[model samples]
Target: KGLKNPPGPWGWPLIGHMLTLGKNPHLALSRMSQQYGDVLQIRIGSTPVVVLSGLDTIRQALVRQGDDFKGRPDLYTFTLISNGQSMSFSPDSGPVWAARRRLAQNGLKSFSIASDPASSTSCYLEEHVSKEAEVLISTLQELMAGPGHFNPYRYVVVSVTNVICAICFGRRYDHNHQELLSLVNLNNNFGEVVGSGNPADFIPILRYLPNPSLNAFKDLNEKFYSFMQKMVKEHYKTFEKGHIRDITDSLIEHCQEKQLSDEKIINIVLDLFGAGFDTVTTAISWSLMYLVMNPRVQRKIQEELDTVIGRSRRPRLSDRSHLPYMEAFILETFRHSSFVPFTIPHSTTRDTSLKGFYIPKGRCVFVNQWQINHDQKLWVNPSEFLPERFLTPDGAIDKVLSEKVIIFGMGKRKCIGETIARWEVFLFLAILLQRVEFSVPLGVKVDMTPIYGLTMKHACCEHFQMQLRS
Candidate 1:
């Protein structure tokens, strides 16, 4: 009915869909999906991107058509930022990517205890999640006792930052370390610069237009590099010989043993910091906002938690099985929030066909998680914050339903940090929610719509204020 392929916004001669996307890309994507079927092609800065929306299409592409769609696009912007060093979002088919993925898999696997998967993972996540969650809960408790106001953004940020610090560096800061705070500030600023789409990414000439953003990125990269260097040096000096646990130290040991170059080591560490920090923070924030917005759902989760887990002991990763509602709550949060919305752009190393549509080699492909998660056919009442959707009639976990969830990406490039990320979120939220009730301030409403960036986060209609209940 429309263009030869799929339905999407029409574009200008040179700009393509950039103008429409710049205004509101998420909405633009939604409009296209609504007008057309799940599979469609859209132009982004003259580059043709094949977008997959429905659950079946996404499943066929990511799972059924896995190897054919495994590669990532090679773009100059990503090339410069990543230096082509890490595996987080690197081109999928390469010797470097293979090595990095193996290293990450091995590192995480070594930490995991086979006897108790969650407990094994919790061994690392518990201390960090507990300390950070305690800080947040105490802060909220104090607020409830006094003016009863709290900034949900700041609360979530602090918890996520502490967790990331602990996971990567083997230590948690008191939110008072000047250097640590500076590093975090720089990270946030860097994210803003990168997350803000650059015209330079498409038009090579515009990259040199006296843009302060690129310069800021360079400065941030240098500062982070120096900080990581110091941390790595100190870690090697203090604990390289001793039997201590830390991802950074382990990574360093691997780098040295494998005879990797300094550039490779630094890039891997930087990738860890880059991928590990803000994304989880964004997820936690979105989860908190949803819990607060739906008091009934929040109460149900609390009741289940309280029943299964007593007040004497905090909720642990081991408690996940017993607390089916909590698990569902987390899953539902991911579904509703649609944090990343679209999958990270992946390319095809070999030419692939999706239902007869030709996805040529080098074409950017997006697995639209937003559409798949909320597809009415797959999810009944998809828009609602109903955790019970994942529950059986007898209140057991709906195992069949749970397996299809794809908040994490798919195929060979699926998140290597999935176990770690899930552990942090489950523990962090379980402990905090056990102690406090998240709610908006009087006369304030929690806006459920997401603010678009590299990831989607809850928009702050007003300051997100939480009330604590012990």
Candidate 2:
């Protein structure tokens, strides 16, 4: 009886706080944290969920008690898709999870996608990103010559997806390739279903309800796996020893050596592809929106681009240090937008106490990333979009403060593609800003409101007028 749980609102029976969270759970939780403190507890269905807010409390749980808090919660939807087998959604902390994580890490290194930026001079990753950037620029140039507003979504998606495809399958797709288009479409569909919270998830009775959306999602999931399976089959036919072509080859080789089932390999590929494409595209889209809204910030980035790397050449990863404003802008965008507000929910491996509160074993933990990023104490004028806040008086990014922007999350289970995602966003933004200007169409207002899902996306796929910069 002395083991007190964290204080929270009195949730109703069965449904509990499900309805209280409303459509935007992140913002709802942020508001709740104000009244309940950083370590707040609430119930969803029969499951007891603890929501951690603010940077300090979040770090305290996720960083300080990392091992205790590193476990994955068993959500119905995640279990259905991943089958508790994929490393991403696996509840098991045993050999399967360890082996999958190791293979994925090793595979990424083999493709040079996970290399240290300081010493990756000869990596194919840079070349792939550069080549994709060129195609993106060419696509943008053609769109600029047209008579209508341009939505950068498709071009951005194609370019970013191609980068993932290159690492996944050892080749890039043409901008207009049908297969590439299909993959993007299916991925978006998959995201929409996953992002839209399922009623069946919170209400057990609703699981029996016939839901067309869920059915379509199931179809899309099958199609996506089938496509990945086809690639696996093709790679199997041409599989060679000691000569890793891409992630697929590496996974195939590892699977054969370790005697891992084909399903395990497929799930690994699916997880990587989903992570690599969706989040990067969302970040780029948000950055474009922010640039349009804040023209001055855009011009400052362009000025840095002009001084550090001229218009004739593309921006390199090394140029990041010289372009402090650009780096600051990206970090500020991450803080301002907070693409993934609530990271994939983590759980406690065992019954543990955090900050004097009893957190039971298997209790679900949600890291409110949006709240941490927008905390009033941590940031000055938290609501305002100020890139210079991340910059020092001498015009350099504050590395310590910058590191605090935990968009990729924290601790051992943090985002695996953090490096590649950072590099892609930097290179894509630098090169795009170097050649083109994105502005709102005449007499049309731009909306910055986000449609929250698995990842936060622009409320509308709004089109921006583009001008070719001389």
Candidate 3:
């Protein structure tokens, strides 16, 4: 039987079609997908990547034929991440990776979804998130009185980090904790080289040269590892199997119970810690930007918050179902912003064919999640920021329709922290909206343009005006 590589635009000698990708590869590749078929191949430098577009096509490869296309590409830059041990970025799609993923998913579920008898909140995650959210509200409120405007990201990032920190390391930090802030790496440029289609990852020649981005990326990883090493070291000394305090302790216990060695256990912690904090932080920050930009939507969500949770007490995870409009708003934020534009680049596990195109083993794959979220075939007026689109005519959350948004990738390599990230965003927004109303100061404009990276981020606007709900 004869097979063929997918059709794509012609490429140059060394750089390939990277120049055609423009500043935002997601949008550029999506346009190319429209020209070619949904499954098309393109090269960045010397590497060939099979770009999968649309929902069904992505689902078919990642779900139906998961094993055929689940491997991570062994780009030289990847080896620099977590010293080549993080499961999420591991090129090894074998049993060892499976066991590591399972251990991590279980470790996460044990703390995030498990019930807590000692706490008034429903679960350990909710307890930590509620406290951090309260602290953030206070932090934001204090700043508002002085300048009458401030950057939301500065505090939201810290609050979100504190929530994941409480779960992973059993600790939280002050809003201005310099040591932790240094570790957080809020400049966020370090991700530019690691994003799905970064030419450096594909071009071996680039790795041998002095590169500014690569140097910054290397520095950030060193700081990240050193910070995590100290945290894990302390956790090990105080860790008790009988008392699985949090995710870190739970991971420690899993190693003892399952007879798995402990070295890789720390790797799981670093992976989860890195994966969870930044994404939740960005999502919640995006939600805040949206809320401030749309005063009508902000008022509506606060109205819903008042009607459901009321001013008597703070919102809890159990209240998630009753707050339909807030749910719709969060769903719309995920859809509208589509902050996570691409799933971390995937690769073929073995030689395979999809949609009559030959994809060789170890070829890189990119699931264009941003394209799926904005696909006109799937969403009506996809460019509009309408929360009501996620609502039913009867005024309830349209559970099925909302599921169409594809922020988290599908199948074997779906983000393991999806559950907690969703809850963290919901809880943080619920708490923020219920307490304070947000807007921009006079003469200051809100710019929603997103800067492309591993996770999409917008310029942190410094003019958000917050007022206590009266």
* Most accurate candidate by lDDT: 3
User: What does the lDDT come to for candidate 3?
Assistant: 0.84
Model 3 TM-score, 2 decimals? 0.96
TM-score, ranked from best to worst: 3, 2, 1
Candidate 1 lDDT, 254-346, residue by residue in tens: 766654565665457567666777788777878877777788888888888788886788887788778888889888888877777766677
The alpha-carbon lDDT assigned to residue 341 of candidate 2 equals 86
Which residue pairs in candidate 1 collide?
A: none
Off by over 4 Å in 2: 1-3, 82-84, 113-122, 186-189, 192-198
Q: What does candidate 2 score on TM?
A: 0.94
Q: Write the per-residue lDDT of candidate 2 for residues 1-470, one digit (tens) a residue.
A: 35677999999887789888877888899999999999998888877889998888888888888889888876666655654466787676556677778878777666755553345564656777888888988887787688466678877888998888888887778778897787775445555445423456657776667976667666666666777878899999999987777889888876777645777865797788878888898899899999998999999999888887888777787787788898898898899988788878888999898888999888888889999889887899878899999888999889888987878888868887888888889988987899888888556766787677668887654567777797
> What's the best-to-worst order under lDDT?
3, 2, 1
Q: Model 2 lDDT vs. the true structure? A: 0.80
TM-score preference between candidates 2 and 3, better one: 3
What pairs collide in candidate 3? none
Q: Find the candidate with the highest TM-score and give its number.
A: 3
Error of 3 at 59 (Å): 0.7
Candidate 3: misplaced stretches above 4 Å?
1-4, 255-261
